[PDB]
From a paper:
Microtubules are cytoskeletal filaments that play various important roles in cellular processes, including intracellular transport, cell division, and establishment of cell polarity. They are highly dynamic tubular polymers assembled from α/β-tubulin heterodimers, which are arranged in a head-to-tail manner to form protofilaments, with ~13 protofilaments associating laterally to form a hollow polar tube. In vertebrates, both α- and β-tubulins have multiple isotypes encoded by different genes, which are intrinsic factors in regulating microtubule functions. The GTP bound to β-tubulin at the E-site (exchangeable) is hydrolysed within the microtubule assembly proceeding via longitudinal contacts with α-tubulin, while the GTP bound to α-tubulin at the N-site (non-exchangeable) plays a structural role and is never hydrolysed. We determined the cryo-EM maps of α1A/β2A, α1C/β2A, and α4A/β2A microtubules in the dominantly populated 14-protofilament type at the resolution range of 4.2 Å to 4.4 Å.
The α-tubulin isotype α1A is highly expressed in postmitotic neurons but is decreased in postnatal and adult stages. To investigate the architectures of α1A/β2A, α1C/β2A, and α4A/β2A microtubules and explore the impact of α-tubulin isotypes on the structural features of the microtubules, we characterized the structures of the three kinds of microtubules in the presence of [name] by using cryo-EM. The microtubules were decorated with K 349(E236A) to aid in the identification of α- and β-tubulins in the reconstruction process through the “seam-search” protocol. By superimposing the global Cα of α-tubulin on the left side, we found that for α1C/β2A microtubules, the lateral interaction between α-α and β-β contacts in the non-seam region was similar to that of α1A/β2A contacts, with the Cα atom root mean square deviation (RMSD) lower than 1 Å. Additionally, we did not observe obvious structural deviation in the lateral interfaces of these three types of microtubules. We first superimposed three consecutive tubulin dimers within a single protofilament of α1A/β2A and α1C/β2A microtubules by aligning the Cα of the bottom α-tubulin together. We found that the longitudinal interactions between the intradimer and interdimer of α1A/β2A and α1C/β2A microtubules are very similar, which was confirmed by Cα atom RMSD analysis. In the present study, we assembled α1A/β2A and α1C/β2A microtubules, determined their cryo-EM structures, and found that they displayed similar structural features. However, the tubulin C-terminal tails that extend from the microtubule surface were unresolved, most likely due to their flexibility. This feature, to some extent, confirmed our previous conclusion that the distinct dynamics of α1A/β2A and α1C/β2A microtubules is mainly determined by their C-terminal tails.
Numbering used by the authors:
A (entry chain Y): 5 to 329
B (entry chain I): 2 to 36, 52 to 443
C (entry chain Q), D (entry chain P): 1 to 426
């Protein structure tokens, strides 16, 4: 009926550039729910500490959404934070290794391993697509010809992506091939703060159309596994040339995501989902029937303290929002 | 004893239209560029019977840089100094700092280095800009970062133009003023401020100019900057160089925001019906009706007051004048600086602009004051910014340039940290 | 140097565009033959921003005149100023749009827009640095509404950074010259709000109202209305065409007039608008122009501004004038009339003044305004849309060009969302 | 600088207003074209108090000419001075009032007064500091009586501090030009006493009496009567229009002529009023003017002052004259004639003298007087009211415009209360 949007926090270890600069470990935790930064507790639903691993985050963050989205509802998981925080590491990581991989392939293995446990008569039509937002253009990742798709509303006025290559998959190994094909197609540039700087908002949708042959009750569960880009200060990164133009549309979308989160948290009237196309496809996640859970990957260094605390204000402002499930 | 100037934005170049009009007039330099040691501070000799300013005009919009190239001052200005852009910053602090800023600083900062090596006695800098548009706000903070790291030890005289308290030419400039002050606090050695409705109000009441345009404003603004540098250009009983302003008015390295004022602001017909001495012009410069910013001094306290006089002024009567200021209780200094007074005298009086509005006087005062009265302007300027920032008004343009939520918060807390110092020193 | 490529689409867009070149050519002192004969050299300073230099001291405008009816080009070509345009820019089909949005957007203009896009590339690459695209079209009919938004999509696609300026002439129910007005209007604004950054909502009902009340004309032809709309186009670009005490680029207008990216629907104005009888009985002082600018009846849109509030307004002045009297009038119009201005913005006014007035007039002004009251134009069009859409009348003529019913639904949702957001900040 | 916005309502108010601009324009040396050609520079000193500066050294009066019959404006426009007025001020309906108070106050003028109020705001906001509203209307008929009091209510509502000056031309039974005189008069004064601060009760019977006895005219047209009423309007405002040894503002007249707020119904006068034959046989000395001023027959109202007593009188003089002879005549007219002056006020006279006489005349004077004898004008109107109201004749034409019988009762009570209070201080 109604549920709370679940805000969680995660911190990485200090990277090479941070420890070589001599950044202080300012992260202090009072339990696994609150973090004390600058003598201020910032409460979240689950603060994953700096010593957490990949499996430890997935078991508590996105382990429940597998059962929720397959029950009949829709899910949405997406990471927020500045660049070099570990959004690409936490979500994608390195998909070949079982331990080094992120939340996305663990979601893939858990759904298929769960479905094999079910009875054979429970039929499952699973179609998957993969696309990104690059220069404010919906660049498909599983296909190269389609430069920009168009946003369309469903039968009951809910926005989706028309023309996306919804590849019908059968086995989980085929899904891993789709991610590797899409991971290579993702526009990723080099920066001093983040060498693997994802310059686009990659969305990896799992549309599990599920129906039992005996009862004939048809259901569908959309699971939006999104990896956003980092809110990069140009003074620290030094974005110049082509990557400077990439920084425009990135922070435009992240600020627009901050606008709708600030608009919906205060209980505003309009909630401008139409501000950016990134906010459009998230409209079903924010103000729909989805049990949306959000993690934020934050850097523990004092050098990025300004952008880090703003990520916590984005998080705690998102904590007061409730979804109409 | 030289000091090279730069002019950013529409306000900066419009100051340079009138400010250099009175510099070249004071040294007998015609617009052609020719007619001993007085003009060397702001004019270099070119071969034989010719002068060139140590001036640089930069404006990303080409609207008014070419106006000087086709105006009356064509021969005086070297045409390579008149640097121009290709497209406009358009009232965006970010656009003049990152996109359009970073394509022309490579020309002008290395060109400013050329005038440095051409000079030998470079005392410091004096920039001209405004916090209104993106040019005066964004490009200056970008250039000040690269000029500070290049030299550092040299001084910088920031003659900014605030947005007025209720009068205003635009809507987005609170974002410009709060962002450019976040960077200007740690870079500028001296930050002189000017207001729009105050200078409109001064010439209306005292000078009796009911319908002024911007060219009438810039005449006396250049007179203010000409007054502080007249001690370098001419001899006097007690000369003061540029280095005195840093040592006398900056008690702490963060509070470096003086307030400028000028007197006697008297028309041509009122000069005959009013006697001018040092006493009445001294008291005239401290009252709120003649301050260049809309802030009353009685609400705060004067931390320091540098009194720079011109023309025939003896040194014994000024000591009587400042005594009356100290015993008058409507204005009161801070206990931590009881001898908050510096005197400067120049024998050469001010010069009248032909066809201007001001009148020739045998003596004049250009008083600079570091005080806590500017904290009221910071608060109301910071207060009005909070309403637009709370609703994310006009944020989609700046973050579309590349910025984010972060530096707005750094600009907010930096302003509170600045005001934290003013309430501290106001004790 | 901040060049401007001009687009004209539809019969109305070609008519206001044709008269628009008539006005500014007289401001620059340009002959109908194209030779320059201006008195002041400042006219020839920024002549490149709308013209291109040619041999024999001749000039040609960068006017891409688009249509689907060849009769419109013959009227422009045979007009007083048809000879100045390049003959190559006249790209036009054979069959008219027939007042169908889907024809110009999918079948009729879709084959022709590819030829037009090559001419846009020709005029753009010849430029030094173009600032924006000044487009003129009406949302009534199929040509300006359907093919125009298609052309805006391609230019916005190739130029995602330039200033997409449009002058959308949108009528009201008080003057319903076409039964297919809501489908042409509702589908056109579905594309404009997502792409463009300026939308000057001009209404024919308001334009006729100017001619009777303040202009006092007995027989206002369309050419009289085109003279008024041309005055607004020359006013907004006056800063970047001549020297001025405050030069505001179109980007510098867009940064102040657009507090949120979707809220970019404006309402223009112009003054002095005096009759022949009231010429000598009116003072040319600045406060007289300001009261005519902010006059609720002197707006060029059907929505009265008193029904809502201004998010942000601009006043581009022309001619010699004191800045202090301008600042007081910009100050006074928000003190006493604070109910008509939102107070969560501290200062809702933008000022600008050029040192060259219009030809023949001593002083002038031009108004821009993004009001919350403008939503009623979208509300009444939605009422007309839902009135005809509830029984699906005249929709089958759109299905022939492949357009589906969901595209009408997506346009109506984006239309109704635009009404709600102006109601938020009211 | 103490500006004055002028209002004209009704046919009589437009006629006396039209001739009023004719007189003072000649005092200031203003052409019918509006260009200034005066000899003395003092005329151009306070020209702003009734005019506005325009280009080409042209001037325009701040005259808001209101009516419900368009024929009245055509006569004023075609007159000797119609070309000086602004064409925008002529706000007028299509159908006349038909001599009904309720039409102009509820149906006919109620829709038109909203348009007129915007013009009052236009002329007021253009002023520096307005002092009061000089209104001219007759209580006979529906336009001046009904719409005029409605317009006074709105201006008094928005301006509760300015001086509401009115010149109510009220007829007597001796000249009964309309059967609906008492209903128009009784209902109009119900609003005037509550709102206004000056009410110059002028009567047509007294005005004709001036032409025969002291002026000695064979065929007194209405224009001859308008010349006399214009002389009183120019006399009361002469202090605040030219330099003078004693400058009394209209507020400085209202403070002395209004001992209680309801007792503000006056009785004007003017001198020298000499015939063509008696020009050379009359001395221009000051005592000759004073005896003509306080002459009981030379009052412009039907009520003789000998039947009551003056609460307070004023004498605004014009031209060069000794103050001592003025003070003696102001002294002597209360010593011997003390029966005609209440003695619970010690000094019932107000004096004032300007240093500029009328054009063509060497000296002049203007009289104001608040007498207890003025109540008989209200008494006889009440007799006519109760004569027709006892059987309710012609009241059904007022019920059609929503006016109820109790409003006639409330007007009659406030009318009769006004008669009792002048009887108190008699
Ligand atoms: N102010 C003006 N409005 C005009 C003028 N011509 C038309 N219009 C108005 O614009 C409305 C529609 O604009 P258009 O005439 O251009 C119809 P369009 O050419 O775009 O389609 P088709 O002619 O069917 O190919 C139209 O109904 C008028 O209300 C004009 O010359 N001036
Ligand atoms: N001294 C003058 N008195 C006039 C003049 N014209 C009319 N009157 C007198 O005033 C009386 C009524 O005044 P009006 O003529 O203005 C009637 P009004 O126009 O207000 O109503 P409607 O004409 O019915 O719309 C009228 O009966 C005359 O006795 C005039 O020109 N001069
Ligand atoms: N006192 C004074 N102020 C001025 C003058 N000219 C401009 N200003 C102020 O400067 C402010 C903006 O300055 P700029 O940054 O130079 O504006 P700009 O160069 O036009 O910026 P763009 O819109 O991007 O072109 C305005 O709000 C004015 O109030 C001047 O001549 N004198
Ligand atoms: N928790 C972690 N433990 C160890 N290494 C990490 C962790 N998080 C990030 N890293 C390192 O950071 C590198 C790149 O970081 P990543 O690309 O995830 O930053 P990001 O926040 O995704 O940047 P973007 O702004 O592009 O999203 C990885 O190759 C990885 O080695």
């Amino acid at each position: 009926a109604e549920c709370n949007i679940k805000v969680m926090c995660r911190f990485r270890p200090l990277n090479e550039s941070e420890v070589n600069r001599g950044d202080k470990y300012i992260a202090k935790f009072q339990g696994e729910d609150t973090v004390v930064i600058a003598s201020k507790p910032y409460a979240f639903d689950r603060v994953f500490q700096s010593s957490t691993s990949q499996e430890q985050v997935y078991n508590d963050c996105a382990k429940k959404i597998v059962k929720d989205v397959l029950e009949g509802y829709n899910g949405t998981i997406f990471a927020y934070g500045q660049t070099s925080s570990g959004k690409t590491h936490t979500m994608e990581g390195k998909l070949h290794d079982p331990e080094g991989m992120g939340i996305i392939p663990r979601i893939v293995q858990d759904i298929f391993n769960y479905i094999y446990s079910m009875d054979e008569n429970l039929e499952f039509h699973i179609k998957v697509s993969y696309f990104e937002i690059y220069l404010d253009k919906i660049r498909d990742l599983l296909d190269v010809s389609k430069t920009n798709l168009s946003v369309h509303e469903d039968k009951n006025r809910v926005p989706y992506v028309k023309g996306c290559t919804e590849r019908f998959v059968c086995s989980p190994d085929e899904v891993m091939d789709t991610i590797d094909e899409g991971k290579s197609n993702r526009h990723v540039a080099v920066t001093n703060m983040n060498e693997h700087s994802s310059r686009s908002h990659s969305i990896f949708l799992i549309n599990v159309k599920q129906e039992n042959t005996q009862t004939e009750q048809k259901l569908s569960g959309k699971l939006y596994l999104v990896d956003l880009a980092g809110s990069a200060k140009v003074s620290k990164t030094g974005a110049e040339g082509a990557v400077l133009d990439e920084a425009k549309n990135i922070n435009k979308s992240l600020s627009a995501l901050g606008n709708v989160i600030s608009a919906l948290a205060e209980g505003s009237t309009y909630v401008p989902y139409r501000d950016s196309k990134m906010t459009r496809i998230l409209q079903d996640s924010l103000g729909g029937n989805c049990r949306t859970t959000i993690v934020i990957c934050c850097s523990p260094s004092s050098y990025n303290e300004s952008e880090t605390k703003s990520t916590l204000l984005f998080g705690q402002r998102a904590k007061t929002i409730k979804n109409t499930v | 004893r030289e000091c090279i100037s730069i002019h950013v934005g529409q306000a900066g170049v419009q100051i340079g239209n009138a400010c250099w009009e009175l510099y070249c007039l004071e040294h007998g330099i015609q617009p052609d560029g020719q007619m001993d040691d007085s003009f060397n501070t702001f004019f270099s000799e070119t071969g034989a019977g010719k002068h060139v300013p140590r001036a640089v005009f930069v404006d990303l919009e080409p609207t008014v840089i070419d106006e000087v190239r086709t105006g009356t001052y064509r021969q005086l200005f070297h045409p390579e100094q008149l640097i121009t852009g290709k497209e406009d910053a358009a009232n965006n602090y970010a656009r003049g700092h990152y996109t359009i800023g970073k394509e022309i600083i490579d020309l002008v900062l290395d060109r400013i280095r050329k005038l440095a090596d051409q000079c030998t006695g470079l005392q410091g800098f004096l920039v001209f800009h405004s916090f209104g548009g993106g040019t005066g706000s964004g490009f200056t903070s970008l250039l000040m970062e690269r000029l500070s790291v290049d030299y550092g030890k040299k001084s910088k005289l920031e003659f900014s133009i605030y947005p007025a308290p209720q009068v205003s030419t635009a809507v987005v400039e609170p974002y410009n003023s709060i962002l450019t002050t976040h960077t200007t606090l740690e870079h500028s050695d001296c930050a002189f401020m000017v207001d729009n409705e105050a200078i409109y109000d001064i010439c209306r009441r005292n000078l009796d100019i009911e319908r002024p345009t911007y060219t009438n404003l810039n005449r006396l603004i250049g007179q203010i900057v000409s007054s502080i540098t007249a001690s370098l250009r001419f001899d006097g009983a007690l000369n003061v160089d540029l280095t005195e302003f840093q040592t006398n008015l900056v008690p702490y390295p963060r509070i470096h925001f003086p307030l400028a004022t000028y007197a006697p602001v008297i028309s041509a017909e009122k000069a005959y019906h009013e006697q001018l001495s040092v006493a009445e012009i001294t008291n005239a410069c401290f009252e709120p009706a003649n301050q260049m910013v809309k802030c009353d001094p009685r609400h705060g306290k004067y931390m320091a007051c540098c009194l720079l006089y011109r023309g025939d002024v003896v040194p014994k009567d000024v000591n009587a004048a400042i005594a009356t200021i100290k015993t008058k209780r409507t204005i009161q200094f801070v206990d931590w600086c009881p001898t908050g007074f510096k005197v400067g005298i120049n024998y050469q009086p001010p010069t009248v602009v032909p066809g201007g509005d001001l009148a020739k006087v045998q003596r004049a005062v250009c008083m600079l004051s570091n005080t806590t009265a500017i904290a009221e302007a910071w608060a109301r300027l910071d207060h009005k910014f909070d309403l637009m920032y709370a609703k994310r008004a006009f944020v989609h343009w700046y973050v579309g340039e590349g910025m984010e939520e972060g530096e707005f918060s750094e600009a907010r807390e930096d302003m509170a940290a600045l005001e934290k110092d003013y309430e501290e020193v106001g004790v | 140097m901040r060049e401007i490529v001009h687009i004209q689409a539809g019969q109305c867009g070609n008519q206001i565009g044709a008269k628009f070149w008539e006005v500014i050519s007289d401001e620059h002192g340009i002959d109908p033959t194209g030779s320059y004969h201006g008195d002041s050299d400042l006219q020839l300073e920024r002549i490149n921003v709308y013209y291109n230099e040619a041999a024999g001291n001749k000039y040609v405008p960068r006017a891409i005149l688009v249509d689907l009816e060849p009769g419109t080009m013959d009227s422009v070509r045979s007009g007083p100023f048809g000879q100045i345009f390049r003959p190559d820019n006249f790209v036009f089909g054979q069959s008219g749009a027939g007042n169908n949005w889907a024809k110009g957007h999918y079948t009729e203009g879709a084959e022709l827009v590819d030829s037009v896009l090559d001419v846009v590339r020709k005029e753009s690459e010849s430029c030094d640095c173009l600032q924006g695209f000044q487009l003129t079209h009406s949302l009534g009919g199929g040509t300006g509404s359907g093919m125009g938004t298609l052309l805006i999509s391609k230019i916005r696609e190739e130029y995602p950074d330039r200033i997409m300026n449009t002058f959308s002439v949108m009528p009201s129910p008080k003057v319903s010259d076409t039964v297919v007005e809501p489908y042409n209007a509702t589908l056109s604004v579905h594309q404009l709000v997502e792409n463009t950054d300026e939308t000057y909502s001009i209404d024919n009902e308001a334009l006729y109202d100017i001619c009777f009340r303040t202009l006092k004309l007995t027989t206002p032809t369309y050419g009289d209305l085109n003279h008024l709309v041309s005055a607004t186009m020359s006013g907004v670009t006056t800063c970047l065409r001549f020297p001025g005490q405050l030069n505001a680029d179109l980007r510098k207008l867009a940064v102040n007039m657009v507090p949120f990216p979707r809220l970019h629907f404006f309402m223009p104005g112009f003054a002095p608008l005096t009759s022949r009888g009231s010429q000598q009985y009116r003072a040319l002082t600045v406060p007289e122009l300001t009261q005519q600018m902010f006059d609720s009846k002197n707006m060029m849109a059907a929505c009265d501004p008193r029904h809502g509030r201004y998010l942000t307004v601009a006043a581009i002045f022309r001619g010699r004038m004191s800045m202090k009297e301008v600042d007081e009038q910009m100050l006074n119009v928000q003190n006493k009339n604070s109910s008509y201005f939102v107070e969560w913005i501290p200062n809702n006014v933008k000022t600008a003044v050029c040192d060259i007035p219009p030809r023949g007039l001593k002083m002038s002004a031009t108004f821009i305004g993004n009001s919350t009251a403008i939503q009623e134009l979208f509300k009444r069009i939605s009422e007309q849309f839902t009135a005809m859409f509830r029984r699906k009348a005249f929709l089958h003529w759109y299905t022939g060009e492949g357009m589906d019913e969901m595209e009408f639904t997506e346009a109506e949702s984006n239309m109704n969302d635009l009404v709600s957001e102006y109601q938020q900040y009211q």
